[PDB]
Swiss-Prot record, chains A, B, C, D:
Belongs to the glutamate-gated ion channel (TC 1.A.10.1) family. GRIK2 subfamily. The chain holds residues 431 to 850 of 908 of the full protein. Highest expression is found in the olfactory lobe, piriform cortex, dentate gyrus, hippocampus, granular cell layer of the cerebellum, and in caudate-putamen. The lineage of its organism: Eukaryota, Metazoa, Chordata, Craniata, Vertebrata. It is found in: Cell membrane; Postsynaptic cell membrane. The modification Phosphoserine is found at S416. Homotetramer and heterotetramer with GRIK5. Tetramers may be formed by the dimerization of dimers. Assembles into a kainate-gated homomeric channel that does not bind AMPA. Can form functional heteromeric receptors with GRIK4 and GRIK5. Can form functional heteromeric receptors with GRIK3. Interacts with DLG4. Interacts with NETO2. Interacts (via C-terminus) with KLHL17 (via kelch repeats); the interaction targets GRIK2 for degradation via ubiquitin-proteasome pathway. It comes from Rattus norvegicus. This is Glutamate receptor ionotropic, kainate 2. Residues 153-208 are cytoplasmic. Changing Q191R: In RNA edited version. Ionotropic glutamate receptor that functions as a cation-permeable ligand-gated ion channel, gated by L-glutamate and the glutamatergic agonist kainic acid. L-glutamate acts as an excitatory neurotransmitter at many synapses in the central nervous system. Binding of the excitatory neurotransmitter L-glutamate induces a conformation change, leading to the opening of the cation channel, and thereby converts the chemical signal to an electrical impulse. The receptor then desensitizes rapidly and enters a transient inactive state, characterized by the presence of bound agonist. Independent of its ionotropic glutamate receptor activity, acts as a thermoreceptor conferring sensitivity to cold temperatures. Functions in dorsal root ganglion neurons. Residues 230-389 are extracellular.
Length: 420, 420, 420, 420
């Protein structure tokens, strides 16, 4: 006779086909556990009739009397022959029904939003000093160079002889004009000295204190840039639950009374009870009621959702903003459910192991869990200083070579007006 | 018998549950002393049946009537059978009731605000070299340039032809005068070369060694400042009670008529009687009325709040800018009270010693005192240095320009005196 | 009945105790499978009574006689009652014996030597700026000095009196030639000033902007190198199997006639058949005879050793220069064997699922696979930089001096051609 | 009658007095528990006779029949009245004897050798580059400057006119002698350019490649010095057992079957079972048999001994090379032992609490646990670069100013021989 396969609606598992023809005859279904059910029926002979569970439930000790609702009800009443579905092999179900041997391995892992292209700025060289320090240095270049001008006109020792070769006199000039006083201050600031040095002691205390001011500015730029660039290099993203146990800034998640939330209750691993101390205290904010609303709260907030790995690897392949941070915490499996007795327990256990040696259970997971190929990495590595973080010293370079053409035209016109 | 348990309302010892439907009846509230009273009752038979004390006190002997208040009046009149609460084992209570053997150990310790590092000074650029090094560099410039003035006069090759711009002969002049030798030493130190370069070989060895000296000093300033900025290490001004006995800048704090104030009043230790000489003099300048009023004055005023040490370990893990400085000053203990003739003294004394070696007094304390955790050991991208960090190079700049005006006037008078 | 348990000698599964007096009798040895066989026996009645297999094999079907070897011959002849050992659930064994439901989960993964950072290259000084930046600076020197040659000829104030050493007039000469403008740009870039300083205002804006450009580039080189040297971050050349399918420089490894070599022989995946195209061609060039011989060739030769994933997690925590690259390739499992007609299949299937949810399969694995820990995340005081780190500045120095001889000969010929 | 005080030999507890007079009459004893026994007898009236335990044992379940050897034998047989001794209040003893209430609080803490004055060298500035790099730079200053000399004599474009003021000829000189070629190479190396720049393209490629070599040397000195100085600042010493659980380099200790070794057996704190995994595996090396041999193994090896806090605070005050790293792990206490019944249980419990309010139990611990005042700190803080780590640039400074006097004498003599 044709077997009765009691299954449930899940994705990429048993689904509905997108079509319109109303008379189906168990051809309305599609998914991983329908492609698995064809290949079990192929090598074991049987015909089958896919009849969904009416309760829409997997299986649960009802704990007032224990009527075992769901797909384990259809098996324990012998109303069903198979339960080809994601029917997880757990302890309380193995006593009342006979599973097959696993066709799927999962655990508990963490969803998180994928870290993206950090933009520290095109003008991000300007960060190691405060925005008033860059102003107070520029107001000290305009301040010292005016004090250089006043002192070098007033001190009698700067008024040297511009032609000492001929030992005569009557021509006495400073090299410190107003234009050459800013060029000392700009020149001494940029660590590359100008063509003109102070000659009097009163101007050698201006120049000698503008040189010490300049050392502390350039050294505290280089040492605070070293402090910025080595902290963001020392900063590594979270890649574990041992990481999540420490940062209370990144928020945890689970499902209301699921297999994940049950695991963190009965836990003596001592990382995960601290992860349960987060949940019992901060409940009704960190404890969402479904798998789909847990994805949305990662996608809105800074939320780290604790899902099973078979539906983390499904959502991550369909949403390149999402990632899986770490490894398997638990270790569970999916098995074809059978009632107790059931000569098809061993026949499917042989049949699953035959499809694993041939490699079909990997080709059926790649057929349903790939979806789209992601935009690859966009070179997500870093730490070499490039155009995206030091590339705004090229705008300032280009804006200084355009302004100098505006003055070179302006000097050519003022010289031409001088000829008239 | 349910054995009525008198109990006061304290945190994190006896806290209301406050989650749902407000009707339980002796399941209304939770905490450390209620988890303790469970595993006493689990080993020793009975049920909880807490009967929270009407008068909100622990117990004290008013001398006007010689009567007891709080809980230890409810013990002696046998209208309570236990006192499972933070009831401290004091001498005057031990003569009246009998205590069990302690379930917590504590003393007197000090709250102080956690060190911050937002005011490092205004000469905090001067830190990466010790003040012995900043003086030895200043004595090296005076040392080298006095060697340069001696060598360059004595060396025959520093005396040259001071006009090759017209080939005439019989002219012998040196460039290294006294002012021109200190300007080489200052100029070579500030990484910006002066207009004077040595010529013979001997001043090129004084010149070349002073250049290698200078690279090692500037690179050690830049690389120790780059260590000071990425690794922030804050230091508190006090780390004990004798260090806090000396600081009159930091004012103290304790509850008026508490177990802490009675310790310093009755003390004979030279530190703890000097510490009473402060807070008896000031007296409502440094004496708050409760524990919560004193915690706020650590947060608002400066402060030094002398309180019990289990209440500090509670508050230090909720607030992350409150820290415990020093160790325990007194040594006291919380014991479960019981009436004078009571079998439950010894039976709980055995029971408290049973949960300890099994480890349950520690695991309850890990449950009810731990909190957020304060995980701020990962530094932010250090700081944009402002006028709070470099800061005092704008002070020494203006101090060097005011000094330059006073030399320019002095060179203006020394020339007009030469005209006379 | 003691129920004779056949068992093979493996690590860290079945290890001799070796501490004292050599006479116990089925208490001689310890491990993971013996801790497992305890808590199976603790729940299910019986005592251990291990009866270690004489023929040191697991079981294989020689086709010449169709007989079984190892343990799974000792199961089918009912001369053993359990097989508590790493007996892998294979298809041909499942048709012959019945397995329990898995107590470990594993697959195929890759050993590779942990990345080292002792050969960063010889041009590893060039890393703190990206190769786009090293080209844009070279195009900036060509860009600025071609602007300097245009502006300084056009600016009327760069043309001056080129001998104030004798006051004679009617002489108009510029210092910014073509060779003298690239020497300003190279000189100002290398932080060491050339003998040419601009004079007008327009070349002082080209000069002053190129000085501020240069401070930001040299300070960003020094501060990103100071991040690269204190935070060592090593990268492996391979992190998967398809990245290792491409690298012909890295040769593979697997046991001859193992469960891993049979996977790649029978595969149809485009990567895992390309990976078989390598190691079937080479064949005793990349095929070791055991697991221990293959681990040594990762340590001595380069290597890529494809083996099981629980043996990697054992070896990766003993050696701290062996690492696991990539994830699991196959998916298999270790199941407790039992004979074909056996009640102990289902009773241990319930029992393995009982220790899992209580957490005992994880806590046994934490006991027997963990080791030293490899705690080398704290860096040593970084490195004295040698000819392995800076290194290639002695190459570009000698390449710049050999190029200088070829220009000096070319200037010697261009002068002797001018004599003709 | 006179009570019988059964005590044991311990330090600073019950000892022998250093004298010679043989007829004592319980005046041969001295220590903390003898000064405590005087003050208990003072306020409770009784006279006492100190009679040591003959077994020399504290107390132990003999576990073949349980004869309770030691000081608990003298109490349970009523052969003793008091047990004024460090008789620790533990669970199994409280059932068979009656302790008093504690006169002493301890726990479990860690001995370690105190970190001392680190000598990184007086010449410790020389560390950021390898000792062959400092040689290869000094051989490249002697190598380039000889290539400068050969090219500047051979290139026809360096032979300029040393007096271009007069437009005549016949005097043509280089400024690149052999002496001025080393002064370029030394001058360009020290980031402070000399008075002489190259004039030909063949010498501007030598100078232009010696300037790029120099930038990478000074930047990789400053960035590797920043890497040295920020790693030893990021390196903090161990101050916990959470620290000791990670470093497998620092070796643990305990006593053979003591109260400390028993605590790490029965431990679920999950830091300390890893600390027991160190002990069971590495036994007979990390597990010494007495408290005195554990002190010696800290004092010889890098060993971290787990002792009680009352004898860590005794040894640390007598040996300034030893320290206590962390806090109390366990929490125990010392009580006066009494048999069951015993009207002196409550009388001493009142008497101990009276001596605690007056503060005598702190004055009796300071009398016996101080010993010597330690040499204070010798300023054990750090991280400001001082004379002990950069002070060898002052020897090289002083050795260059002495060598230059030797050349200044040598130039004065060669000039004097030139006059002849
Ligand atoms: C890259 C640079 C390295 C190499 C170059 C080194 C250059 C050599 C010169 C170095 C001079 C440095 C002064 C040494 C003072 C040491 C004492 C001290 O630490 O504290 C005192 C500093 O009080 C002051 O006066 C600081 C003044 C700084 C500049 C003074 C000379 C100006 C430079 C002249 C230019 C020509 C000099 C050349 C020769 C004449 C007291 O201040 P404080 O407030 O108590 O600070 C601590 C408290 N706080 C932080 C919490 C606020
Ligand atoms: C403080 C300094 C910053 C500011 C100053 C910057 C100065 C501006 C000049 C910058 C020139 C730098 C060249 C950059 C090349 C980029 C490509 C690359 O990264 O790899 C290539 C480098 O191969 C080479 O050839 C490197 C040669 C370096 C010096 C070349 C010019 C000489 C200096 C001219 C002096 C006058 C110049 C002035 C204008 C003429 C290939 O090598 P690789 O082996 O594949 O390396 C990776 C592999 N490995 C590490 C694992 C081994
Ligand atoms: C930013 C700077 C880079 C660029 C500048 C490069 C500078 C030039 C190259 C310099 C090479 C230096 C050689 C040292 C090699 C190490 C050997 C050694 O340690 O022996 C001795 C050190 O010996 C010295 O102290 C040497 C002092 C430096 C020489 C100064 C010359 C300046 C001019 C040069 C002009 C060029 C000459 C051309 C002339 C025409 C002993 O020291 P120690 O045993 O280690 O001390 C014990 C403590 N410790 C072990 C704990 C650490
Ligand atoms: C004549 C020139 C020789 C001088 C040499 C100098 C060498 C060493 C000199 C000083 C070092 C010794 C300092 C010891 C500590 C004293 C504390 C102190 O004064 O700090 C005070 C200021 O700090 C200063 O003002 C420092 C003086 C700077 C002017 C010197 C310029 C000389 C430049 C030489 C050029 C070379 C010329 C070359 C020659 C050819 C701090 O005061 P405050 O209370 O914290 O203020 C807070 C203000 N607030 C409220 C706004 C926040
Ligand atoms: C694979 C790499 C190629 C090399 C081949 C490998 C092997 C070599 C094989 C053969 C040797 C080839 C060398 C050329 C011929 C030798 C003689 C000579 O130079 O001729 C003449 C032209 O002089 C010049 O070429 C330079 C002067 C003009 C400037 C040109 C742009 C400068 C950029 C270049 C550097 C960019 C770096 C900086 C960029 C920021 C010499 O005349 P001059 O006296 O020098 O100039 C006259 C001005 N003066 C009269 C006022 C004084
Ligand atoms: O056996 C089960 N299988 C499940 C399978 C899935 N699944 O996603 O395939 C889910 N779930 O949707 O979270 C819950 C399950 N609960 C179960 O009890
Ligand atoms: O009750 C005890 N008291 C002890 C006191 C001490 N003590 O040092 O005073 C020691 N000990 O010497 O390690 C061991 C002890 N063991 C005990 O069981
Ligand atoms: O629930 S099971 O059928 N038996 C228990 N386990 C594990 C021991 C890890 C596993 C591990 C992976 C599976 F696919 C199934 C199971
Ligand atoms: O009030 S007690 O029961 N007896 C006196 N003492 C101390 C001697 C320190 C201590 C010390 C710690 C406690 F927990 C209890 C007490
Ligand atoms: O050999 S099995 O018992 N059945 C087949 N499989 C897999 C489907 C992957 C797995 C996967 C993990 C196991 F632990 C066991 C098995
Ligand atoms: O062995 S006891 O008499 N009772 C148990 N405890 C502690 C709860 C920490 C303590 C703590 C400190 C003591 F001094 C005595 C004891
Ligand atoms: Cl008691
Ligand atoms: Na079953
Ligand atoms: Na310069
Ligand atoms: Na750094
Ligand atoms: Na009493
Ligand atoms: Na079978
Ligand atoms: Na730096
Ligand atoms: Na007792």
């Amino acid at each position: 006779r044709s077997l009765i396969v009691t299954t449930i609606l899940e994705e990429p598992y048993v689904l509905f086909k997108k079509s319109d023809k109303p008379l189906y005859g168990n051809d309305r279904f599609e998914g991983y556990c329908i492609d698995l059910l064809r290949e079990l029926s192929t090598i074991l002979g049987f015909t089958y009739e896919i009849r969904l569970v009416e309760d829409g439930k997997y299986g649960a000790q009802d704990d007032v009397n224990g009527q075992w609702n769901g797909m384990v009800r259809e098996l324990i009443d012998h109303k069903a022959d198979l339960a080809v579905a994601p029917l997880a092999i757990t302890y309380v179900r193995e006593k009342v029904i006979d599973f097959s041997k696993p066709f799927m391995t999962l655990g508990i892992s963490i969803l998180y939003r994928k870290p993206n292209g950090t933009n520290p700025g095109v003008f991000s060289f300007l960060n190691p000093l405060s925005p008033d320090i860059w102003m107070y240095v520029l107001l000290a270049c305009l301040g010292v160079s005016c004090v250089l001008f006043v002192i070098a006109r007033f001190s009698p020792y700067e008024w040297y002889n511009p032609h000492p070769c001929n030992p005569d006199s009557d021509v006495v000039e400073n090299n410190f004009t107003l234009l050459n006083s800013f060029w000392f201050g700009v020149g001494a600031l940029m660590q590359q000295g100008s063509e003109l040095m102070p000659k009097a002691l009163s101007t050698r205390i201006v120049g000698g204190i503008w040189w010490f001011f300049t050392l502390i500015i350039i050294s505290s730029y280089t040492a605070n840039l070293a402090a910025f660039l080595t902290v963001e290099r020392m900063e590594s993203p979270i890649d574990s639950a041992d990481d999540l146990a420490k940062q209370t800034k990144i928020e945890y998640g689970a499902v209301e009374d699921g297999a994940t939330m049950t695991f963190f209750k009965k836990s003596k691993i001592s990382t995960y009870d601290k992860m349960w101390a987060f949940m019992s205290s901060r409940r009704q904010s960190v404890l969402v009621k479904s798998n789909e609303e847990g994805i949305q709260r990662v996608l809105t907030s800074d939320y780290a959702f604790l899902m099973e790995s078979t539906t983390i690897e499904f959502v991550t392949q369909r949403n390149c903003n999402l990632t899986q941070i770490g490894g398997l915490i638990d270790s569970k499996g999916y098995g074809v459910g059978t009632p107790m007795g059931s000569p098809y327990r061993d026949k499917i256990t042989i049949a699953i192991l035959q499809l694993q040696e041939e490699g079909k259970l990997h080709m059926m997971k790649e057929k349903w869990w790939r979806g789209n190929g992601c935009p690859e990495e966009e070179s997500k590595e870093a730490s070499a200083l490039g155009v995206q973080n030091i590339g705004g010293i090229f705008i300032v370079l280009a804006a200084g070579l355009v302004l100098s053409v505006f003055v070179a035209v302006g000097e050519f016109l003022y010289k031409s007006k001088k000829n008239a």
